[PDB]
Amino acid sequence: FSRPGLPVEYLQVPSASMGRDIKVQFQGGGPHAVYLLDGLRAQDDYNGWDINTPAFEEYYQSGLSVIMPVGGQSSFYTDWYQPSQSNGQNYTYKWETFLTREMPAWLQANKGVSPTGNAAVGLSMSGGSALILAAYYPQQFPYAASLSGFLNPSEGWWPTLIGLAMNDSGGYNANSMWGPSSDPAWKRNDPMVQIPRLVANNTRIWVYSGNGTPSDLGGDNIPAKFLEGLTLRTNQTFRDTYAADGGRNGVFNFPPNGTHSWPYWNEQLVAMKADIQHVLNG
């Protein structure tokens, strides 16, 4: 429940690549849009942003549309190698294809939403996704925000931790997604590795990380709050590497009282609104 009178819609958008309809929550308001990507435990009824935050209310009459894709638990909003090998998934996740081709084509044709000049905003699994979308689709996403994202997924223990978190969230298999940790797909989808693309594209990036407890990150099966701490440290390394590589269009927010939780992710979504407005609409 939120503010009465919001013109929020839900849509059924066919995905040819996944052979099914993808539900999408939507609020109009302008030709450019904020894509609000969900976390590891994404449900099939509503996007976590609508469940847990007043995102639609906060961006109402902002001059921006809001797009909340629904579904894709543990998908990393990526195109997988194969159907998840364990939990009986009967198709291959193709969420990069959906977000960069199928969905923007549908929204353009039916509503006049621009496929270019948008923002991607993600958290947990989709924080990295948002930066990867900006790295490889800069005309679509000149703005990307990562809130408690896993920003060096190919490094050290990260492939192991991501595998653990995915198995704990619906029994999904990281091997089916990007292959063994040595597979090129891990580095392809590693924001840290792709920093020079973000720099050369002049992507406007907004990067947040909390720390500690409680956590909505997922990966609760990982012991000793290790994921919560490693997430922060890798985000801090990302800030430093971005600067060292010539990056000059980023904001890095690591407040010591911040948590990896919907209340802080919403606080950041509100805080970045003026930032997004100035970048996408002038």
UniProtKB/Swiss-Prot annotation:
Stated role: The antigen 85 proteins (FbpA, FbpB, FbpC) are responsible for the high affinity of mycobacteria to fibronectin, a large adhesive glycoprotein, which facilitates the attachment of M.tuberculosis to murine alveolar macrophages (AMs). They also help to maintain the integrity of the cell wall by catalyzing the transfer of mycolic acids to cell wall arabinogalactan and through the synthesis of alpha,alpha-trehalose dimycolate (TDM, cord factor).
Binding of substrate, residues: 40-41, 124, 152, 230-233, 237, 260-262
Region (Fibronectin-binding): 56-66
Enzyme Commission (EC) number: 2.3.1.122, 2.3.1.20
Compartment(s) where it occurs, according to its Swiss-Prot or TrEMBL record: Secreted
Gene that specifies this protein: fbpC
Lineage, uppermost ranks: Bacteria, Bacillati, Actinomycetota, Actinomycetes, Mycobacteriales
Residues of the full protein shown: 47 to 328 of 340
Active-site residue numbers: 124 (nucleophile), 228, 260
Cellular component terms per the entry's GO annotation: extracellular region
Organism: Mycobacterium tuberculosis (strain CDC 1551 / Oshkosh)
Catalytic activity: an acyl-CoA + a 1,2-diacyl-sn-glycerol = a triacyl-sn-glycerol + CoA; 2 alpha,alpha'-trehalose 6-mycolate = alpha,alpha'-trehalose 6,6'-bismycolate + alpha,alpha-trehalose
Subunit structure: Homodimer.
Top-rank lineage group of the source organism: Bacteria
GO MF terms held by the record: diacylglycerol O-acyltransferase activity; trehalose O-mycolyltransferase activity
Predominant location: secreted
EC class: transferase
Protein name according to UniProt: Diacylglycerol acyltransferase/mycolyltransferase Ag85C
UniProt key word DNA repair: no
Assigned protein family: Belongs to the mycobacterial A85 antigen family.
